[PDB]
Design a protein around this ligand. Structure first.
Ligand SMILES: Nc1nc2c(ncn2[C@@H]2O[C@H](COP(=O)(O)OP(=O)(O)OP(=O)(O)O)[C@@H](O)[C@H]2O)c(=O)[nH]1
Ligand SMILES: CN[C@@H]1CCc2c(ccc(O)c2O)[C@H]1O
Lengths: 282, 231, 331, 52
């Protein structure tokens, strides 16, 4: 089964890199895709590409060989990169949702509200907060556990596992996945209300001569992200509170299901005639 | 040689800095085009609340309107310049069915159809004002003039159930027939790319600027909703 | 009675030029060697305009040029170093044409306000304003520093005296809007293409029409003189280009293709007159062979419709403008 | 208006025109003679090209 399992993990790496490089090259090469909204998509694509290049291969090798060989420093560096890439990708979807909210709800002030300098400042701030949550606590050994098994895991050189305390796990869950969930829920409820009211107006003024699309689009956008990332961030909180309820295999499987989400963003945020024509040209 | 190159770069920086301030003002203003059927009373609408330009501001939003009077011909070669405006304002005198002047309502309908079906105005909405309502009401209440004599389709029309009359039923039926004459042309040609907003306007109205503001807001909101694949 | 004579007169004119068609230009140039394949690449890209671009005119020194845009600016560039030299704001935001004086001291402008404005570059403030046209201006070309010819949408052209601001002479006879004009190399004759699908040859000094050409099917959009001065080319929105000869008083060749259905916005000749460059509505430019009528190249680097096109006096570069607010230099 | 249109046609119809075999030859000779200094037909070396 090792031969078969290694085949599947090889296709995941290829799918993530192929889609993300195509989006980055298409935006940079062509001048019609230089809009303000595309900067957030570029940042998200860069984060997903870094994830696919740096996290999936080493994790797959660790799973397949059942042993860590790169030492006690590269394990911690890999963990820091993992947390940094996961945190900075979920928080860009929040920025995209807020951008659409401001575009639709307040159309007259949208041009004044958003500017290229403001977009750059927001992106840099998001990446800085992502870096503070991952590298700073991990590299300073503030996330370390206390039980004897964790002590042995940290002492051994061929072992590279994940053990953490309650405070760090709880805090990291909230910044990466919970504050951004309620924000997008609140945004998209209002967006749906606006779309429905406009449809009602059009029907009232023009009905005699003549909400599936909005519902379907919002359902896709919400469902993909939620189904990909919710079970992992639930079991992340549960394991610290109950030690014997969650196994390691379930933890790894849910984490990998979450990793898979990086290969679906081009299929969701890059469906438009301007992008399809660009892809055809290349 | 060396000094001349630095001198040119100094002037470019000053010019490029001026173009940044101009771009902020240009992107925050909305342009409107005003049209008419020839004797539609559009001058009064401008007065109360080559080329003639006017500027006004409502709710801290800048609008800027265009009226063309220097060119008068049946062929509009210059109409392709106005393909980046927010909306077009069309003014028509609804109380001129009997005035042959071939009647003026048919000419106005033909002009509206020509403007709607244009290779360049394929994404521009129209705000329609049906002017001179009091004259229409008086002439309809007068028994002598009959619309069905000039418009034979009026012999088989009934007032829509989903209507909002204030008014004797006859004038309401006439108004809704005239509005539907434009709506039936509007609906067929376009598919979601642009719409039409018809209004009933008189000589004593003062809420026309509010109507333009709300129609522009709806136009931009619908444009964004369609762009984001939500409509 | 009078209309009968006009029909009779138009009958013999067709017969008068029918006996002069000994052969066609295509037959004579069958043995000539093909030009081959011509490929050009973009050398410069000019940015700074906030809206779509309508007009463009090269300088006599083949270094500087001017351009006009709907946002209300008139920017003078430096094609070599890509440096903005001037930026003149306009009173009216609707501009349709611009011109650059042969001496380099003045720049003209015009549009939907039926007024031509002259600016003093080496002094930048408004110098003169010319009024009297009853339609939108379509084109304007400088004869000298003290006289300029303009065409408008009131089916008339005029010759102005800048010092006094009065029309020295007026040219009448067209039935539709005049869309473009072009001056002869010696500045003694000029041609105009109008919306009635006809072109006319005028005389600046005397002031009457000489010849009329009616080969096209729809409105004529562009016109240009052959470098020799004995021929000219036109372009209409029926996807055809035609070459007319003055001494033969008829059409020589037609440049069209079955895969082209869009209109034509501008035409221009090369330094030797061998190549013919025309801009189209389908977002790109094409290059023809004047003596053989076959395609030789395509310039497809623009995102919106190409509206203007020009070739330097020394013929080293070709500049095009489009509706995406960008200018490009092709060499 | 009718008289003016008739007068113009009579004035225009009385001109001398040469055959096509001469005009085509003239344009061909001019192109052949002046094709030497046509930078667009034959690309110039980058040393003498101000735009590259
Ligand atoms: N009762 C009534 N009269 C109107 C109305 N609009 C214009 N008029 C009449 O029009 C007369 C003056 O003409 P204008 O208001 O300038 O209309 P207009 O000259 O036809 O405007 P244009 O033809 O578009 O240039 C006034 O004396 C009014 O009696 C209207 O809405 N109601
Ligand atoms: C090694 N896997 C880590 C474990 C904990 C964790 C992840 C991602 C985001 C977070 O905020 C976390 O706290 C996972 O990617």
């Amino acid at each position: 089964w090792v031969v078969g399992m290694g085949i599947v993990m090889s296709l995941i790496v290829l799918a993530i890199v192929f889609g993300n490089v195509l989006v980055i090259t298409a935006i940079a090469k062509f001048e019609r895709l230089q809009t303000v909204t595309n900067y957030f998509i570029t940042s998200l694509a860069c984060a997903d590409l870094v994830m696919g290049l740096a996290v999936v291969p080493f994790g797959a090798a660790h799973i397949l060989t059942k042993t860590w060989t790169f030492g006690n420093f590269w394990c911690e560096f890999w963990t820091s990169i993992d947390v940094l890439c996961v945190t900075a990708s979920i928080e860009t979807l929040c920025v995209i949702a807020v951008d659409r909210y401001f575009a639709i709800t307040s159309p007259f002030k949208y041009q004044s509200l958003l500017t290229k300098n403001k977009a750059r400042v927001i992106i840099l701030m998001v990446w800085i907060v992502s870096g503070l949550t991952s590298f700073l606590p991990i590299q300073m050994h503030w996330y370390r556990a206390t039980h004897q098994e964790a002590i042995n895991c940290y002492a051994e050189e061929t072992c590279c596992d994940f053990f953490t305390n309650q405070a760090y796990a709880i805090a990291s869950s909230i910044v990466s996945f919970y504050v951004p969930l309620v924000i997008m829920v609140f945004v998209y409820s209002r967006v749906f209300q606006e779309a429905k009211r406009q449809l009602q107006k059009i029907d009232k003024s023009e009905g005699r001569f003549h909400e599936h699309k909005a519902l379907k689009t919002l359902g896709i956008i919400m469902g993909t992200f939620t189904l990909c990332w919710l079970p992992f961030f639930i079991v992340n909180i549960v394991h610290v509170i109950q030690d014997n309820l969650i196994r390691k295999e379930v933890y790894i499987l849910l984490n990998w299901i979450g990793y898979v989400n990086s290969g679906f963003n081009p299929l969701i945020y890059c469906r438009s005639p301007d992008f399809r024509i660009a892809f055809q040209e290349l | 040689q060396r000094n001349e190159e630095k001198a040119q770069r100094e002037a470019n920086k000053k010019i490029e800095k001026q173009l940044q301030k101009d771009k902020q003002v240009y992107r925050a203003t909305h342009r409107l085009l005003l049209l008419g059927a020839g004797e539609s009373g559009k001058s009064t609408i401008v007065k109360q609340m080559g080329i003639f330009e006017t500027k006004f501001q409502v709710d801290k939003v800048n609008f800027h309107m265009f009226d063309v009077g220097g060119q008068r011909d049946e062929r509009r070669k210059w109409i392709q310049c106005f393909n980046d405006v927010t909306a077009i304002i069309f003014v028509v005198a609804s109380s001129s069915y009997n005035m042959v002047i071939t009647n003026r309502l048919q000419e106005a309908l033909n002009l509206f159809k020509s403007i709607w079906n244009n290779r360049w105005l394929r994404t521009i909405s129209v705000i329609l004002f049906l002017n001179k309502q009091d004259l229409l009401a008086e002439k309809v209440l007068a028994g002598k003039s009959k619309i069905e004599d000039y418009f034979p389709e009026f012999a088989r029309y009934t007032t829509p159930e989903d209507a909002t009359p204030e008014e004797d039923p006859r004038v309401t039926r006439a108004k809704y027939f005239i509005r539907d004459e434009f709506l039936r042309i509007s609906t067929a040609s376009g598919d979601g790319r642009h719409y039409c907003y018809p209004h009933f306007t008189c000589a004593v109205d003062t809420e026309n600027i509010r109507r333009v503001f709300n129609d522009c807001r709806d136009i931009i909101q619908r444009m964004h909703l369609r762009q984001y694949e939500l409509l | 009675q009078l209309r009968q004579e006009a029909e009779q007169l138009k009958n013999q004119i067709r017969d008068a030029r029918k006996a002069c068609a000994d052969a066609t230009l295509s037959q004579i140039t069958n043995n000539i060697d093909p030009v081959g394949r011509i490929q050009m690449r973009t050398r410069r890209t000019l940015r700074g305009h906030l809206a779509k671009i309508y007009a463009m005119h090269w300088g006599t020194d083949s270094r500087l040029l001017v351009s006009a845009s709907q946002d209300g600016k008139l920017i003078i560039w430096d094609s070599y170093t890509t440096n903005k030299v001037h930026a003149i704001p306009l009173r009216s935001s609707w501009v349709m044409t611009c011109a650059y004086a042969p001496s380099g001291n003045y720049v003209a402008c015009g549009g939907l306000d039926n007024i031509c404005s002259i600016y003093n570059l080496k002094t930048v403030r408004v110098s003169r304003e010319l009024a009297g046209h009853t339609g939108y201006l379509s084109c304007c070309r400088f004869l000298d520093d003290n006289q300029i010819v303009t065409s408008s949408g009131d089916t008339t052209c005029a010759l102005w005296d800048i010092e006094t601001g009065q029309q020295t002479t007026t040219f009448t006879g067209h039935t539709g809007d005049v869309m473009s004009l072009s001056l002869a190399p010696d500045t003694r004759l000029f041609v105009s293409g109008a919306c009635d699908a006809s072109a006319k040859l005028w005389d600046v000094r005397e002031g009457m029409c000489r010849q009329t050409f009616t080969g096209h099917e729809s409105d004529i959009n562009a016109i240009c003189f052959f470098p020799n001065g004995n021929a000219f080319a036109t372009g209409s929105d029926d996807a055809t280009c035609r070459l007319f000869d003055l001494r033969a008083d008829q059409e020589l060749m037609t440049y069209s293709h079955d895969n082209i259905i869009c209109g034509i916005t501008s035409v221009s000749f090369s330094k030797s007159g061998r190549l013919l460059l025309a801009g189209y509505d389908d977002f790109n430019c094409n290059v023809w062979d004047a003596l053989k009528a076959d395609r030789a190249g395509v310039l497809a680097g623009h995102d919106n419709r190409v509206s203007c096109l020009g070739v330097t006096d020394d013929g080293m570069a070709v500049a095009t403008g489009s509706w995406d607010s960008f200018l490009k230099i092709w060499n | 208006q009718a008289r003016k249109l008739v007068e113009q046609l009579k004035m225009e119809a009385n001109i001398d025109r040469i055959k096509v075999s001469k005009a085509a030859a003239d344009l061909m000779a001019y192109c052949e003679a002046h094709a030497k200094e046509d930078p667009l037909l034959t690309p110039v070396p980058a040393s003498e090209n101000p735009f590259r």
